[PDB]
Amino acid sequence: MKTTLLKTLTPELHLVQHNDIPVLHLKHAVGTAKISLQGAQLISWKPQNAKQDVLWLSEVEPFKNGNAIRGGVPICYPWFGGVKQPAHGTARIRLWQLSHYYISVHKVRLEFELFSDLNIIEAKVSMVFTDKCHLTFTHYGEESAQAALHTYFNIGDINQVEVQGLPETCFNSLNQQQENVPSPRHISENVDCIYSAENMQNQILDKSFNRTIALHHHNASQFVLWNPWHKKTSGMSETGYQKMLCLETARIHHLLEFGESLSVEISLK
Template identity: 55%
Template sequence: MLNIQPQFIKQIAPTLSLQQYNEIPMIVLDHPVGQAIISLQGAHLLSWQPKHTAQNVLWLSEVEPFKLGTAIRGGVPVCYPWFGGKSSPSHGYARISMWQLSDYQITEDNATLAFSLFSDDDLIEAKITMTFSDSCELNFKHYGVENAEVALHSYFNIADINPISVEGLPTSCFNSLTQQPEQVPSPRQVAENIDCIYAISNNATHHIVDPIYQRNIEISHKNASNTVFWNPWHKATSGMSEEGYKTMVCVETARIDKPLSQSDQVSVIIKVA
């Protein structure tokens, strides 16, 4: 998992603590339902391992240095208020901004943590609420007056890229590498650099079938307009080792085609069977 020894800072609740990983403060959940780690830089879920799984559900780069002001490679980055390189920094400023743990509720059966992003004049811009039980639900809400894009850029941990397949994707997408629409197979496997944006229904569900780990990761998108499917294959990628692409695949929950208006929300629910 995280390749840096943490420094304990503060106990927040019996199952919740504040710890420091190199330059970045993290919220660490150690609960009977499972374990999770969230970076306060970016409100970035780095790790989630429910109690019934032998492996982490999320992938995190083994060479990640955890530097302030540098986006973390892996987990579930929050790309907001824009997606891609249309402005600077790429994928928006939210993932390199400090968020606040603004609320939490912990019971025997689940834990809910809320993280808020404030502007320089202390006005709320966005909130992401994370609920951990036998599933993981991330709910993002946009508070700004101007429309915004968002992607919950989920990196999933897999045993090996070659035999996995992703079920439920449409058969047409926009290929970001060629900048052209194209027809693609479904289910879909990875044997090359893939960076595709799919238009989806509001409540689409996709499955990552991993025969080596013998598990099925179910990804249910709520109020989303797009799924982004990405694996860099052999392409050199910042923050990732040469072999990193072999154990990860991104199936993202996004609002790109239909940007968020004020108070709009988008969610993803992740389950493992």
């Protein structure tokens, strides 16, 4: 819970150490953002006039080097979930570098890169801030890879949310079964399901904070909808599930090849 200023890059962009991990802080006309250099992980984004942060970050987040941060937009790569250990690959537990920052009147662009232990580029993340947030991940790996932008959206109450635009079926990881489903969808229990990405737009209606989080995905093959509900979840308080929902942009069954990207554009309405 201790922070220190590490570096003033510009008047609008600072590097601040949160416990063990360096985090960029952006404060600009377009709004504010925080990006952990560990995992090039956007953990806060509040566009101008938004009353609440768009992203959720665990109120008990440790900020410990090498331990995945619970919240924001973790980068799962080059494997998804627990098919191997550590779950979700190594990207989100490795320090990235800020390789470029562009600041102008109505827009801010930050680029992050991840390097192999042999000093060769492995992946890139770009983030473009306007009234919307466009985050893109590109793979420069050695083999085909899975990836996912595991976005944790901040909401007023899990009981007052509807998820618009997903298919009427999905694969339920909970019981490993394909199942039929409502659209819109509401969450009234532990949901851990993989949808085919038929249409690239879906949105999250929040009647507690009274806003809509609209999502325009690019190059997704799968969309993972997840809320742990009552399961104890490492780095989550016992009450955390009520204020978050994950709608993940993903390439799980359609792999990424060298130079292919996947991205999401986040906005409020």
